[PDB]
């Protein structure tokens, strides 16, 4: 069933995240790209060939705005918090509404990793540029992980990941590397835990494992 439910799993998550995409083209794009190792379609809105659309940054800001408790500012902040309702929604999308906190927190780390990948040089970002709303979403999910705690991940590691995502001074901001780092963490954490391995395989697209 893991094989047969792959496409439905990612699709169900993205339907929640992109519920405010009225036109629906970003929602479709985020689903279709998970079959690909990389893509030339970049969402940075910056000419640098890459398929660029200068309206992508504003449209993504608008699509993600309502998922936060308070409207975010232009920069990414560890005080940007996703609504508790939306956290419940993304957990319900995976049948984890009433799972243990250690399983829910693992799932949120995995979804954060997924958005690091989406924001990275191989997918919707480039070597030098990266869509901030994708990074913001990953950063805010990590605040939930920090509050729930997760064995094998320290608060200092969470803050390190957030500092990289938000572009803090003295942080290596590259999200391709950050994805690899969080992925290695998720793998180490599920090595001897079949329940966590199941959650990982529900969330992370096959091509990106």
């Amino acid at each position: 069933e893991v094989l047969f439910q792959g496409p439905q799993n990612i699709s169900n998550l993205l339907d929640q995240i992109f519920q405010h995409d009225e036109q629906g083209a970003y929602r479709t794009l985020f689903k279709e790209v998970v079959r690909k190792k990389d893509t030339n379609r970049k969402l940075t809105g910056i000419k640098e060939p890459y398929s660029i659309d200068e309206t992508d940054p504003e449209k993504l800001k608008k699509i993600f705005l309502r998922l936060y408790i308070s409207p975010p500012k232009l920069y990414i902040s560890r005080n940007d918090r996703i609504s508790k309702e939306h956290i419940k929604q993304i957990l319900e999308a995976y049948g984890l509404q009433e799972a243990a906190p250690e399983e829910q927190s693992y799932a949120l780390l995995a979804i954060s990793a997924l958005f690091c990948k989406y924001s990275s040089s191989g997918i919707f970002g480039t070597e030098e540029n990266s869509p901030p709303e994708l990074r913001r979403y990953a950063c805010s999910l990590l605040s939930e992980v920090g509050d729930m705690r997760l064995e094998g991940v320290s608060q200092n590691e969470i803050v390190d990941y957030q500092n990289r995502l938000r572009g803090a001074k003295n942080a290596f901001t590259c999200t391709a590397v950050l994805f690899s780092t969080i992925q290695k963490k998720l793998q180490l954490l599920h090595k001897d835990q079949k329940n966590l391995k199941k959650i990982y395989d529900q969330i992370i697209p096959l091509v990106w494992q």
Binding site: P57, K73, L74, E128
Partner: protein
């Protein structure tokens, strides 16, 4: 004099500056208005990245000029 800083997301920021102001000074004024740390700001005028230490006059940035702002967030 007034200059404008256009973000990628549609907002235009209006600043009061002098021709003698450094790029860092301008980034600090953007921080005052929008909270963005100067170290994350990339400012662009006429397709060129503006360098800290240089002045608006150095780049012949006159009154009512429009600069563009990108955040330094690598994929």
């Amino acid at each position: 004099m007034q200059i404008f800083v256009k973000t990628l997301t549609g907002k235009t920021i209006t600043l009061e500056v002098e021709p003698s102001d450094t790029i860092e000074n301008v980034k600090a004024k953007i921080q005052d208005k929008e909270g963005i740390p100067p170290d994350q700001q990339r400012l662009i005028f006429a397709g060129k990245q503006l360098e800290d230490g240089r002045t608006l006059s150095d780049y012949n940035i006159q009154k009512e000029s429009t600069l563009h702002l990108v955040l330094r967030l690598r994929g």
